[PDB]
Design a protein around this ligand. Structure first.
Ligand code: FE2
Length: 186
């Protein structure tokens, strides 16, 4: 039943099964993501980089219940501190490394956001975040190696909040897709 994905295509089929229902077995989804061994040739089509910031490239629109996408992080590129809009969010490294910094939800008082923790996500590892866990910022701190990650969100969402680290104030951000199914979408 839970079988090792042989290919990205195979993983995508398995994901369609795991999200056949109304709920989400987070551990099984994370297990399957982690078991797929990144094969660059199978995701080259989606790995479209931008010189100035990380790009989000839609891979599969899911069955209504999730989106699967590939994020490409140039050297030194990172995200804001942000939430995931009441969704499950899985992140699997396909190439390089990313630093994830965890932050607590801020209190309504204006205060510096101090980090709860940090980790280095390494190739093939799959992390999970959701709002009840906290907020995070994800960065590729490498000076020399681009990173590529595979992200699954469920339900799909196209807006989130970015947080100001000095004060914890949030602002709503609309998320863009740099490409969809291999096609650049300006
Ligand atoms: Fe995130």
């Amino acid at each position: 039943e839970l079988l090792k994905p042989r290919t990205l295509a195979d993983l995508i089929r398995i994901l369609h099964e795991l999200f056949a229902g109304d709920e989400v077995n987070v551990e099984e989804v994370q297990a399957v993501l982690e078991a797929y061994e990144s094969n660059p040739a199978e995701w080259a089509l989606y790995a479209k980089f931008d010189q100035y910031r990380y790009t989000r490239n839609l891979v599969d629109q899911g069955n209504g219940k999730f989106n699967l996408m590939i994020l490409c992080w140039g050297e030194g590129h990172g995200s804001s501190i942000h939430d995931h809009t009441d969704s499950h969010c899985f992140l699997k490294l396909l190439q390089g490394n990313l630093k994830e910094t965890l932050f607590d939800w801020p209190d309504k008082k204006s205060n510096e956001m101090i980090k709860k923790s940090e980790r280095t996500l390494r190739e093939n590892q799959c992390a999970y975040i959701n709002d009840s866990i906290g907020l995070h910022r994800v960065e590729n701190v490498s000076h020399t190696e681009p990173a590529v990650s595979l992200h699954l969100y469920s339900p799909p969402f196209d807006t989130c909040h970015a947080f100001d680290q000095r004060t914890g104030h949030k602002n709503k951000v609309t998320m863009t897709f740099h490409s969809k199914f291999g096609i650049r979408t300006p």
